[PDB]
């Protein structure tokens, strides 16, 4: 199936608290595999997955030199944007970037992206054509003109279509056996009182990997796509995820409801209901 290599980059100014913080995090198929953080005593890209330990010192040096170089260039960018937006030197501001390639099973580029934000709002992005830019505001028009003159889209496209794709292939070779792991959700129903003649049934999905999951409650074979409470999917903290969905039902009618759990790791969706303790 499809794969991806993305870097999420953050630079945050901190007037009166020292130099700006620069963090770069790399992801393979949405999994963190390298990280650089300018706030370390000796800033360097570090492996964040065991399978990256294989890369020799020349790799880590080359990567670290790019990070330190861009740390300093992003420091300047922060000052540049203070001018573009006519802002004071006393406030903290953020530049964020998401860059990378999604490749299909056939090894062709499905999507290449390069998206910037300033203070949490869209700034500039490379278009789907990998040739032109979308500037979100007046300030980003200045950057756009600089980049169209510099032929930046062509340099970036080469990275996205070439370098990125080729390095993704290399990382996947080392990481595929680890990245492939999926943990299917284990599910159970809990029972809680409500006022009067109602009870809450809460369907739990625990221990699952890829975060993506759907929980539904049904009465008969019809989904209760309203009056059902749920939580955002959340990390257990051990690399697995949690979610729940609850419904309010009549006291005595608990056995009329069934919870449905849908996950990519499940060959068939889970079916369960409230069962009182053994």
């Amino acid at each position: 199936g499809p794969h991806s290599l993305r870097y999420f980059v953050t630079a945050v100014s901190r007037p009166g608290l020292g130099e700006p913080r620069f963090i770069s995090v790399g992801y393979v198929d949405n999994t963190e595999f390298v990280r650089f953080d300018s706030d370390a005593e000796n800033p360097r890209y570090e492996p964040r997955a065991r399978w990256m330990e294989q890369e020799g010192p020349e790799y880590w040096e080359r990567e670290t030199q790019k990070a330190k170089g861009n740390e300093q260039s992003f420091r300047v960018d922060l000052r540049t944007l203070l001018g573009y937006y006519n802002q004071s030197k006393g406030g903290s501001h953020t530049i964020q970037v998401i860059s990378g390639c999604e490749v299909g099973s056939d090894g062709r580029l499905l999507r290449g992206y390069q998206q910037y934000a300033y203070d949490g709002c869209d700034y500039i992005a490379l278009n789907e054509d990998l040739k032109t830019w979308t500037a979100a505001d007046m300030a980003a028009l200045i950057t756009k003109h600089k980049w169209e003159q510099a032929g930046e889209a062509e340099r970036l496209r080469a990275y996205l279509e070439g370098t990125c794709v080729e390095w993704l292939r290399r990382y996947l070779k080392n990481g595929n056996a680890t990245l492939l792991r999926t943990d299917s959700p284990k599910a159970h129903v809990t029972h809680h009182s409500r006022p009067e003649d109602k009870v809450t049934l809460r369907c739990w999905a625990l221990g699952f990997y890829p975060a993506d999951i759907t929980l539904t409650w049904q009465l008969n074979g019809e989904e209760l796509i309203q009056d059902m409470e749920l939580v955002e999917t959340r990390p257990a903290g051990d690399g697995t995820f949690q979610k729940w969905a609850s419904v309010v039902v009549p006291l005595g009618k608990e056995q009329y409801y069934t919870c449905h759990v849908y996950h990519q790791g499940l060959p068939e969706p889970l079916t369960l209901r409230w069962e009182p303790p053994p």
Binding site: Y45, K66, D77, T80, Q114, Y116, R155, Y159, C164
Partner: peptide, 8 residues
């Protein structure tokens, strides 16, 4: 492999 970013 990190992209070497241009300036804004």
């Amino acid at each position: 492999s990190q992209y070497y970013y241009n300036s804004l």
